[PDB]
Design a protein around this ligand. Structure first.
Ligand SMILES: O=C[C@H](O)[C@H](O)[C@H](O)COP(=O)(O)O
Ligand SMILES: O=C[C@H](O)[C@H](O)[C@H](O)COP(=O)(O)O
Lengths: 255, 256, 255, 256
């Protein structure tokens, strides 16, 4: 079924995770046709500034995510940054996420694949659509069975990203495709006004799921404040994409 | 608002080809009554890569052929101009005067089109940022244009490649009606037909005021853009699909 | 010999042209090894705003340029924007310049070639280096014998241009290459601080000439105010590029 | 200031290959006394496109081979790290710790290199703007780095292509010494050796603190970057040329 990956950008506190988790649980009950996966990072490994928020550590993060899975019975996903983190994370993560900048790091991919868990690789801003084939092959070599490729924008000049929707049908040739509606509109080193419009495009073209970061009060988020979606708007956007998908799916090309 | 569909053969290879495509467009206009069809075809391809490629049969012949289409089928007409002097004669048959992408900044050409009293559709240059189309519209308004369109046809992305930045649609909608060019946006400067349909679906899901599509009875035999012109028999199905997606997505279109 | 095309961006007045022309004449006498060509546009056909300065017309422009050629005996070059302007311009212009946005307009190229004059085509911001071969062929078809291709930057994201120096050796395969030091640093819709550094790169790589707009008081220019080079700095930059060229020329690849 | 030349085989294919290249570099260091040579070679290619491509013989073997080069030729050494834990062992032989382009933003890796007390050279990411390297340097300084370098190795320009924006050299010089990577800047992601020499000439004419060049006795047989590694016999001539261009251009280098 259609996948929806959502949650707060960073694990600011398990309290925050539980609040967002509650709403995601509710939506989960309202849209039985959709598979929800709760996402949150235990560490922001590449903030621009050394003085910005990174997180509270892997242990605190895995624990908080554990609380969410136990308290709401929701699937979990979080990203790893070095090979050694794959094993401890796979304890609670149903899907291991590979950061865009690290999509080419062979050891990280193999470490993730070895855990037996599903792997979702964010397509690097520097990577061409057809070059993701090699990424998938590495993961298969490492034993991965459930593989996802996430479109999150491509470098377009300086401090700007563009979404080349031709990438969706191309990557679909070798993996399930997810569209990241949050980071695709960000300006490296973004405009929330473009999040919904581009999400509509993604489902009209055809993808296997959408990725969206949401926060009760984006204004106060410790990361991606200007792009995280207000929690109260999540339901409406999901309903909208299911409606558009229902109609457009009739024309999705056979890949 | 009535959705605009601009379609027709890339070039006026012959008056016969035009009537053949025109006949099909006329039939679709009778079916899709919620759509405003505009027949398009260039009397001249002024910037073919090679000096040896087909350009056309001249302005006189072209206007004459386009007039035959309007007279026989009662369809609106659009064609592009390349120099200021062409605006007047072309305005005699063209309901919408098209401004080529490479020429979207030529002040005199814009002014020439504007003073004819006809609608003007400017192809956004492959080098132009979406927010910079504001001054292009300002020039047209200054010149007397009352009905203005901006067409998204891709942006330079490395060498011999174009990418469609759909953020341009809501941005340009701030100052003009927006049209999505489904044919030229997938061509590799100096074409990939498999991406025509998916990208047009994205355009209507995002929200635009119309779509531009070149169609030919037999693309394979086309004298220009043979790789991207849509087979005529496929037009009806594409239009039905974009109307369906437009309908379901419409309640979510943001207000400017 | 090495070509140096210089002059004020636009013909603000024949007075301005004579002042710049005087200095160019002087430099002409100081550097006999260089072929100087005076440049100035009689019309800025694509200003962003309808309210910006365009010029005083073709007649006034051709007349002013005529005064410069007669009073100083300097070669002349100016750009045309529509086919009909080719003939009247060729009366005084030794080199007819084709604007970057119009480098693909067949009739404009043929009209310029038919005049018998030399033709310098500014490479479009949208054009790939290898695609200039077709441009040259069009001009040869039209009778052109002396053909130049000018590097002036390539579209790089929005409102930015990058100079891919690989273009110099590539275009050299079919025409003489000129490097435009002024427009290459401009930000469409620029930083004067990068003009000199990039000029040095151009001569180190290897070109047949340089193009530079200069004005007695750039601060007061009616066009390209932030990028035109102060007249007083022209001599030093020219001396610098001749010195660098003298040394680097030993390594210019055989094309 | 003493010009820096970082050179060596892309990968440590064997300790034998290293000594062969090292011998030539040692000879050039005796001739070009105004140059500070640093021998470079990766103990691991952690991001080859294919899982089937050559990666290396391990960290232990690599450090051992690099140590043999330093001991036998008395040359400075540099190699890249891919994860935080590698910084300590690598710092035992490496005078300069290199940070891969894709990893230029990984805070922990930067911090790990910085606390070793060794110099750190960060390859500017293909996705990073020149002005955004300021925070990368800030992180290193925060971590204890006293000698920092930023290497220009090209920027993403469309698909499978990189362009070198030479404006980056004077921009990055504001906060660190700048090195120009002559090998990777001409490679087509997922190589054009004919552009290596001309672009390196541009780099020195613009002004940099050093150049980075991969060289192999027989590029054709290289296990990595066989298309762009410079034939060893050509190194001397390239170095002489950049020193000559640097000299003549130097009086014109702008002050930061
Ligand atoms: O503006 C021109 C449009 O891109 C056309 O598709 C153009 O005529 C391309 O022509 P060619 O196939 O000669 O490059
Ligand atoms: O960062 C990696 C450098 O670009 C190398 O040249 C890299 O290993 C490229 O490898 P491949 O030839 O497998 O794509």
């Amino acid at each position: 079924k259609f996948l929806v990956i959502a949650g707060p950008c960073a694990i600011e506190s398990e309290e925050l995770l539980l609040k967002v988790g509650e709403e995601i649980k509710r939506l989960s009950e309202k849209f039985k046709e959709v598979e929800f996966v709760f996402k949150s990072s235990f560490d922001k490994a590449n903030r621009s500034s050394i003085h910005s928020f990174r997180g509270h550590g892997l242990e605190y993060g895995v624990k908080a995510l554990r609380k969410v899975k136990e308290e709401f019975g929701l699937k979990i996903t979080t990203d790893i940054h070095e090979s050694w983190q794959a094993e401890p994370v796979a304890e609670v993560a149903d899907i291991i996420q590979i950061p865009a900048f690290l999509c080419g790091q062979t050891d990280l991919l193999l470490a993730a694949a070895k855990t037996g868990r599903a792997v979702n690789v964010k397509k690097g801003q520097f990577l061409a659509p057809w070059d993701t084939k090699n990424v998938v092959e590495k993961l298969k070599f490492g034993g991965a069975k459930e593989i996802y490729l996430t479109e999150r924008g491509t470098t377009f000049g300086y401090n700007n990203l563009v979404v080349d929707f031709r990438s969706l049908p191309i990557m679909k040739q070798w993996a399930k495709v997810i569209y990241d509606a949050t980071h695709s509109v960000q300006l490296p080193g973004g405009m929330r006004e473009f999040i919904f419009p581009l999400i509509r495009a993604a489902v009209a073209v055809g993808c296997d799921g959408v990725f969206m970061e949401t926060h009760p009060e984006p204004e106060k988020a410790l990361s991606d404040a200007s792009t995280q979606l207000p929690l109260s708007q999540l339901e409406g956007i999901i309903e909208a994409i299911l409606e558009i998908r229902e109609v457009a799916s009739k024309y999705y090309e056979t890949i």
